[PDB]
From Swiss-Prot:
Gsp forms mixed disulfides with the thiols of a variety of E.coli proteins. These mixed disulfides represent a previously uncharacterized type of post-translational modification. The level of these proteins is increased by oxidative stress, which implies that Gsp might protect protein thiols against irreversible oxidation. Homodimer. Disruption phenotype: Cells lacking this gene do not produce Gsp under anaerobic conditions. Cells lacking both this gene and glutaredoxin (grxA or grxB) become hypersensitive to H(2)O(2); they are even more susceptible to oxidative damage than the single mutant lacking glutaredoxin only. This is Bifunctional glutathionylspermidine synthetase/amidase. Catalyzes the formation of an amide bond between glutathione (GSH) and spermidine coupled with hydrolysis of ATP; also catalyzes the opposing reaction, i.e. the hydrolysis of glutathionylspermidine (Gsp) back to glutathione and spermidine. The amidase active site can also hydrolyze Gsp-disulfide (Gsp-S-S-Gsp) to Gsp-SG and Gsp S-thiolated proteins (GspSSPs) to GSH S-thiolated protein (GSSPs). Likely acts synergistically with glutaredoxin to regulate the redox environment of E.coli and defend against oxidative damage. Residues 1-188 are annotated as: Gsp amidase. The chain holds residues 8 to 197 of 619 of the full protein. The two activities reside in distinct domains (N-terminal amidase and C-terminal synthetase). The two domains expressed independently are folded and functional; liberation of the amidase domain from the synthetase domain highly activates the amidase activity. It comes from Escherichia coli (strain K12). Induction: Expression level is unaffected by H(2)O(2); however Gsp rapidly accumulates in E.coli in the presence of H(2)O(2). The lineage of its organism: Bacteria, Pseudomonadati, Pseudomonadota, Gammaproteobacteria, Enterobacterales.
Length: 190
């Protein structure tokens, strides 16, 4: 059963908390405007409590010391080309790999959905946490709002088809569109 807004549901790898995002009983006006809904970790802005972008930015901050910049819609992350190291403001390259790419997803990668279906007009972002032969595990906010089983540090598992040198992820929802994954690397592909 779904938990009240802000409830701790579990942790992603590295001890990164996953919180419930059900804001159905909150005033939309208030939810959008009030500063109590802004998540920070030591003066660093992580995002809007407790949306998908906030979790992805906080996961990268806590486990890699980097963040991506302030997008209005999650699907816009797929068009970013850098990450910022918070300790010194240095810029690191970030590349996009469309679903079905011969460049395999990797743990830590951002996984982005375009707008559509379950993800309406915002799209979605999750973090890939584990790679297996026929699936990946991911962690995210704004999808699962019920506590995770003890010891489970992922929210969903997605089927991964590996054929003819390409990797294709299939969503657990039927009406969505996965754009692809992002990896911290320079563009070294034609």
């Amino acid at each position: 059963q779904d938990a009240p807004f802000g409830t701790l549901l579990g942790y992603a790898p590295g001890g990164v908390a996953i919180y419930s995002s059900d804001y159905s009983s909150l005033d939309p006006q208030e939810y959008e405007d009030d500063a109590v809904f802004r998540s920070y970790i030591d003066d660093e802005y992580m995002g809007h409590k407790w949306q998908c972008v906030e979790f992805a930015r906080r996961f990268l901050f806590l486990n890699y010391g980097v963040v991506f910049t302030d997008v209005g819609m999650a699907w816009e992350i797929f068009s970013l080309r850098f990450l910022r190291e918070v300790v010194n403001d240095n810029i690191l390259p970030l590349q996009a790999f469309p679903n079905g790419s011969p460049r395999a997803p990797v743990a830590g990668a951002l996984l982005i959905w375009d707008k559509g279906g379950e993800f309406k007009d915002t799209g979605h972002v999750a973090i890939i946490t584990q790679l297996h032969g026929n699936k990946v595990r991911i962690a995210e906010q704004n999808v699962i709002h019920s506590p995770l089983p003890q010891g489970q540090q992922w929210t969903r598992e997605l089927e991964m088809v590996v054929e003819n040198g390409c990797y294709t992820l299939k969503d657990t929802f039927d009406d969505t569109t996965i754009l692809g994954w992002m990896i911290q690397t320079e563009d070294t592909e034609y």
